[PDB]
Swiss-Prot record:
PROSITE patterns: LRR (PS51450)
Protein name: Dynein axonemal light chain 1
Gene name, Swiss-Prot/TrEMBL: LC1
Origin organism lineage: Eukaryota, Viridiplantae, Chlorophyta, core chlorophytes, Chlorophyceae
UniProt site (Controls the orientation of the C-terminal helical region): M180, D183
Keywords from the named record: Cell projection, Cilium, Cytoplasm, Cytoskeleton, Dynein, Flagellum, Leucine-rich repeat, Microtubule, Motor protein, Repeat
UniProt function note: Part of the multisubunit axonemal ATPase complexes that generate the force for flagellar motility and govern beat frequency. Component of the outer arm dynein (ODA). May be involved in a mechanosensory feedback mechanism controlling ODA activity based on external conformational cues by tethering the outer arm dynein heavy chain (ODA2) to the A-tubule of the outer doublet microtubules within the axoneme.
LRR repeat placement: 47-68, 69-90, 92-113, 114-135
Predominant cellular place of this UniProt entry's protein: cytoplasm
Organism of derivation: Chlamydomonas reinhardtii (Chlamydomonas smithii)
Family under the similarity heading: Belongs to the dynein light chain LC1-type family.
Domain LRRCT: 155-193
Phenotype when changing R194D: Reduces swimming velocity
Other known facts: Outer (ODAs) and inner (IDAs) dynein arms contain the molecular motors that generate the force to move cilia by ATP-dependent reactions. There are two mechanosensory systems that monitor and respond to the mechanical state (curvature) of the axoneme. One system involves the central pair microtubule complex and radial spokes and the second system involves the outer dynein arms.
Length: 194
């Protein structure tokens, strides 16, 4: 019943009139019935730079081998709980878009050594120890955490400004946070405290 990767690719090729093995952006989002599993058919997407698997029912990241040029992995609005099984794309992946999932731990994110952009609004991160795990990512410049419990804690206390300083204290070279540039004043506040 669930849409398979093979079937979603066929739907995409018919909608976009392209050969999916040659496409840079492969649009597999919002299938009806939803996709539930990533699988080995993804290995056929040899040209893919942006894989859009958002708005499905995927529970597990898997099956990313064979996409040698993948830059953007888009998995927002699924049922994912864990960052894992990304080794096959770590050498090229620059952006992980995974907002509106159920991720409570950032363990595993450290394998994405080339990551520049992490969009993960509306997940289940509750505490600063998870954010500390992002400090290893030397190229991370754009981060979205809005809607996670940790973010909401500060918003509930009208202290989002304080939350932003705490992020930049941990991530000193971050350039953009929750869609808003890190202001020089925020960087200096984080510095004079760090």
């Amino acid at each position: 019943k669930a849409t398979t990767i093979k079937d979603a690719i066929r739907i995409f090729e018919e909608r976009k009139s392209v050969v999916a093995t040659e496409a840079e952006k492969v649009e597999l989002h919002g299938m009806i019935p939803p996709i539930e599993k990533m699988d080995a058919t993804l290995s056929t997407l040899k040209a893919c730079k942006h894989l859009a698997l958002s708005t499905n029912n995927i529970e597990k990241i898997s099956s990313l081998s064979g996409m040698e040029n993948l830059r953007i992995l888009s998995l927002g609005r699924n049922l994912i709980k864990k960052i894992e099984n990304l080794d096959a794309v770590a050498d090229t992946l620059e952006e992980l878009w995974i907002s509106y999932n159920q991720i409570a731990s950032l363990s595993g994110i450290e394998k994405l050594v080339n990551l520049r952009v992490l969009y993960m609004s509306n997940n289940k991160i509750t505490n600063w120890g998870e954010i500390d795990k992002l400090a290893a990512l030397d190229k991370l410049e754009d981060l979205l955490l809005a809607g996670n419990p940790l973010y909401n804690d500060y918003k509930e206390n009208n202290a989002t400004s304080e939350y932003r300083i705490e992020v930049v204290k941990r991530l000193p070279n971050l350039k953009k946070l929750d869609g808003m540039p890190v202001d020089v004043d925020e960087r200096e506040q984080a510095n004079v405290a760090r």
